[PDB]
Design a protein around this nucleic acid. Structure first.
Length: 50
RNA sequence: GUACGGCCGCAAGGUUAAAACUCAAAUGAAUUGACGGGGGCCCGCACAAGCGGUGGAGCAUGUGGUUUAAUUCGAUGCAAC
RNA sequence: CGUCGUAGUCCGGAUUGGAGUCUGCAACUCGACUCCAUGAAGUCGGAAUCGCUAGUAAUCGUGGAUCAGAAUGCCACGGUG
RNA sequence: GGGUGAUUAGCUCAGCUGGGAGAGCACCUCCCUACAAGGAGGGGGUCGGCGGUUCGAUCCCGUCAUCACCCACCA
RNA sequence: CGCGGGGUGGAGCAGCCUGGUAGCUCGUCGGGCUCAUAACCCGAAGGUCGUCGGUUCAAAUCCGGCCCCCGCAACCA
RNA sequence: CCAUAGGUUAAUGAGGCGAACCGGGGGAACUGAAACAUCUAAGUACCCCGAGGAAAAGAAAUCAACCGAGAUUCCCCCAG
RNA sequence: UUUUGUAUAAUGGGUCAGCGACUUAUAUUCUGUAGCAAGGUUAACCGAAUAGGGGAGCCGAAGGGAAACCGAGUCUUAACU
RNA sequence: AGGACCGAACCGACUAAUGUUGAAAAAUUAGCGGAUGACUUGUGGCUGGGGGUGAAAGGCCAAUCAAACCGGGAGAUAGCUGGUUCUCCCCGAAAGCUAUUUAGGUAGCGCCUCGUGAAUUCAUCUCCGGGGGUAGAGCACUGUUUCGGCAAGGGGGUCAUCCCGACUUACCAACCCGAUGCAAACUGCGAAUACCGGAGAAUGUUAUCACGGGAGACACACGGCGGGUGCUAACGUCCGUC
RNA sequence: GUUUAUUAAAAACACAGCACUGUGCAAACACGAAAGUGGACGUAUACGGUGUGACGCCUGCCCGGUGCCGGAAGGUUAAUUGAUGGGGUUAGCGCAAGCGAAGCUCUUGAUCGAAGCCCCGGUAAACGGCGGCCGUAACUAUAACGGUCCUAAGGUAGCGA
RNA sequence: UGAACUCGCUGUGAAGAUGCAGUGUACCCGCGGCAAGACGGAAAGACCCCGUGAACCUUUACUAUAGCUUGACACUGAACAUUGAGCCUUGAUGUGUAGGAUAGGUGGGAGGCUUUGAAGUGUGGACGCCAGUCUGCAUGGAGCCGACCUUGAAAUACCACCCUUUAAUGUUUGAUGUUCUAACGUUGACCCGUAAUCCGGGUUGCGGACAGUGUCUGGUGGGUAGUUUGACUGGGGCGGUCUCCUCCUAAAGAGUAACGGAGGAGCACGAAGGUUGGCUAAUCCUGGUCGGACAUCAGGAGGUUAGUGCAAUGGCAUAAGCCAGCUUGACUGCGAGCGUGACGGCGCGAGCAGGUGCGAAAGCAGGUCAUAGUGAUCCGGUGGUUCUGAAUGGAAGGGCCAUCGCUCAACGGAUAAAAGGUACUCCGGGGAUAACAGGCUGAUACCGCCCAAGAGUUCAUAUCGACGGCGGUGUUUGGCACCUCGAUGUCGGCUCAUCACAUCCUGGGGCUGAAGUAGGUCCCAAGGGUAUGGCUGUUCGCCAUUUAAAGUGGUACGCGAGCUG
RNA sequence: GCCUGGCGGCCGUAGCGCGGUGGUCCCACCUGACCCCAUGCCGAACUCAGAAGUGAAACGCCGUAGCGCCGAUGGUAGUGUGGGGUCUCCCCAUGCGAGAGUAGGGAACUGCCAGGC
């Protein structure tokens, strides 16, 4: 048994992602996270695994 | 036909064949019942099948088990309660 | 003729809550009746096995015997069939 | 000598937070029906002996003895 | 010394390992076929699935001790 | 039959020997990898064949890099 | 001689004699010493084989960065910090 | 006739004895035994190294053999073994840390040492300040505990159910009054000594530091002291420590 | 009869006979890096492989595992076949992005097939295997007995401190 | 064969003296004869233990191979038939609905086409809108078709392109069998070389597209061969431990040993993070409906004796505990410096820019209450890359930047690939390490004394003793690991010594539950004494008969340079 | 001197028991609640506006040497270094020295600012 790491995609319109461990057996519903990005040098939301 | 020896067989076997112990018996025939998953003709409501029930609830009225001081003694398959 | 409408309740009535009817020496405990509320079980019954046939089954009325007092029991009468 | 168990009815024995007398067969009697069957009540218990504790030692636990069965010495 | 398991109606053995959940045969207590018993058939009565805490929607089941056991191995110099 | 295998006669070539070197053939294990198989060690060791005064190589369907080389072998280097 | 440690009942020695052991081979560097010095040095070979030539090649004086690329600077870097 | 009874020649190993630096590379003396056979033997051949030969012991294979003998790779390899040199001097270790197919070696730290450059290296005494909980002391809190008394509730037993329900607490355990033992794992207290640095006196060592070169050791043993362990035993055991 | 030279001599080994297995003969089988020979100038009353041990009386069950045979229909399935598509290059095309003809070079995987193995049946005189627990008579004790966990199945005949 | 004026004790000593301490004994050397002693001699011990030594014994360890088995393709052929499989080739197709009319799709379109072909229209076969077409007939046999009429996006001669389903001809390729020689073969026969069993040449039969063999290859194969094959432990095996975290033993710094004393980890929370605002327990008692025995919360009594992701340690209400909002700082790239381990690795942190969030602002925010939650190096796969790929330009490839993973967990990891056994071995080292013996100790062992619950019909102590205590002994069973593994013969059997005294017998006698004879018990004493028969490897044991006894112990539990084995 | 409030310092001499004591001043109760503000509901809390009531609770001071707390001198426990022995203890030399109690101390002291007499 493992919680597994999933990739949330940046609102920068690219394939760039942030990985987090998110167990489908405790919280399967979608998540969106605000983080800093050093390429746009400002904060963006990372959302959804597909 | 159990035991012992002798004879005979490749062998399974073939032959001779007791004693002790124990019981008023073993056994042939004919006779009449009764019994059968036996026979033939047959009847019963017995089987069957068209229905009603008792078996489940609560209450009553008898019989066992349980129990005390007595909780009475028998009847108790068809033939009781 | 109106009215309710398969419901563990609407139908069903047990152990209740209260006051009354009665015989007798006397019904607290073992008896019956009545009136006004309350209320449990009860949705045709386990295996199995029991009884029948026209005025018979089922169904609804009445009397009487036993008896100080009390039986849906016992013995007779009749309607619907 | 020592080791580990047993000691409760003739023979076999049950009973592990310490409140234990009970069963089978053995021995009699009654009802059964004349007996066996079936049913019931009785006769017989050092629950081994002796210390410490205690409300009290089948159990906390020391020791004596008999039965059980087993050792030491060459490895 | 332990290791892995077991903890079940009276006896012997299932289920478990998937919480929505105590079972079968021999027995014990009666019904049915019987004259009568057994088989067979239909019914009943029964287990705190060790013990105290914990975790939980919940604990015979998981988690920690304690406690009683089964089996395997209890000899190497 | 002719023929030819076979038979005979004459001639040439080889044969055996000689120190070391040398082309080709057969071909390890140890050793190192502080351990072992690939890799290293080694085409060594030893054995075999064969041959010359030397054996072996060569002047390109080779080697470079747009510059060009213009046979091979031997030496110092390229280069740890 | 072995050992922390042996007069040691711990191994060893009959005795005299001839014998018997840390090197040179190569690369690089540290030290010494010296020549030259931002330079130093030659190898094979040539040659008058202990002269003189031969500087091919090597060691050195510039660094930063995987590297492209930059250079008294440079990589990190939007950068100055 | 004979895988027949005894038995010369012929063969031959079983018992016994002698021998055992011998006569001896296996014999000698006496006996029992093999002797038409699955036998024995004269003479010459044939079977070879993981191959032979074996009615089969890994016995025999020229004395050798869980793999013969000689010559080569080979002076293979040995964290081991021991052999490792004539004469005066300067400084002066270790058997500890950390890692390793690690507990026989080796590698970073501790300990030894030579050169080079720049230089005093240190402690004891007194007092002041600072981080400090061992020794001792203790019962407050934890856990444990004795003695005396009261004792909720739980676990056990009993009799009443009318007397205000009552007796009992050997067991498990809360409250409480009065006392006492234990503690590495506790604290209503805590030294001696040690260690760090000032303020101050006294004494004498060429020192300390960096760089550039070499090491040696990381299996020692013992008496005392500080503590566990062992039977408050061992020339026993495991450490600290002088 | 055989058994090792000088401490290990018999019960071990061989033998008369017993069984199973391979062999139709240019046998099967073996040695020979082979040329060849042995098998054997033997031919099923004859040879190769392995165990048994004269003679007399004699031979229970198990094919799950590991071997072997009968069946090859089915499954599993390889090298190989290599339908489809992609990567590299390139004449060429478009403003660029981005596209791209042919030939080459790499690559992919639609999918087939032998033997084995599995599957079905047999094979133990093939290598082998032949188990436990619980309860139970009319004293003690035992169980002819009944169950129960399991295995491929868990001992007919004979011997036994 | 070290040198030797090499006598005995009790001590000491790497603990057995000859050589050291004390003490005791002795004239010296030949001749013959014997051996207790000189840790004996020949052999670096075989055996026991340790171990990044060797060799066998084995096995689906790793790997290979002889032997065997499997298929295409080749030396190596003519062809024939019958057909499994794939593939090419071709025809029928094709409608509804309303109307002549089955327009398949679709691109062209008036002179062009069918003779192996159309009609009939059905008997009968498939399909079916029952019409029609095909298989093949009854059967004929060069045509035909368009206008007018009218459907529809679209036309009905003539001619391309595209197809479902399906069979036969063809074709590639496996089977089944067919004849027949020529690759191949004869362990057939004959003639000749040749008074030759081989070989060569010829002859004449019979086999054979078989065999034999090769390239490549699926599979097998301990028969043969090379190699790998964990550790700690005041002994081994089972068990435990092996990397990470904490406390105590542990010493008024740290380190610091013991299967000394005891517990945890190899992750989880997008929330339980951030920040601003508000608040804070336990426990008992009292008291009250819908509530079956108990669901309510208010008050007092009182406590930092509640809560926190978990070990133990310590923190925490200024809360890190419980909530309310806003929120995502669970921030990026970096960094003076400090602490720390030998390094790997890591914690703390001033300072800079950029972008967020809470708040009035100060101030805080580059994660959770802290201490455990992994796998390097090597590398396969993949996306990017205005780094590079050495003839030039691309590019397999190498680098850089993203993305992931080996319980390799023997954890700090010996290699795309490695397991067991040796009493059949065997090598280097050793009492560093056990066994038979020497030392140390005396719990164990046997005994006495202090003392006394009791037994001894009274009575504790004649004789005997549960309990507690303190010794006598060297001495056993064990503990222990010093001197011993270049080699101390072990058990029993025979044959034969020396010293003790803890006395079995022999001499002495005491106490007594001793009148006497005895029994029970005590101690002065080691001068003399202390069997034999049967069974067994034999002590140990048992049995029968003898005896003043049928004593105990030390001497490696005495006598292998003694006998037996 | 005295009284109080804030920041506090020091933190038991600052404690406990029991008693006394203040409303000019400050301090708390108190007296009300639109608005800004607040409530999973509420002027309860938070918050505002103030003087009719009071010196109670709350806040602050103080007497009291009974106990806590601090604790001399003497002795004790322990101990650094040294000598011995009768040996995990004792004896000696030479230094250090708690813990508890006693006598004594002690019912504090104070920096900055501000109000009051």
């Amino acid at each position: 048994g493992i919680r597994e790491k999933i990739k949330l995609v940046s609102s920068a319109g690219t394939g760039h992602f942030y990985t987090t461990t998110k167990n489908k057996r405790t919280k399967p519903e979608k998540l969106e996270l605000k983080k800093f990005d050093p390429v746009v040098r400002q904060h963006v939301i990372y959302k959804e695994a597909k």
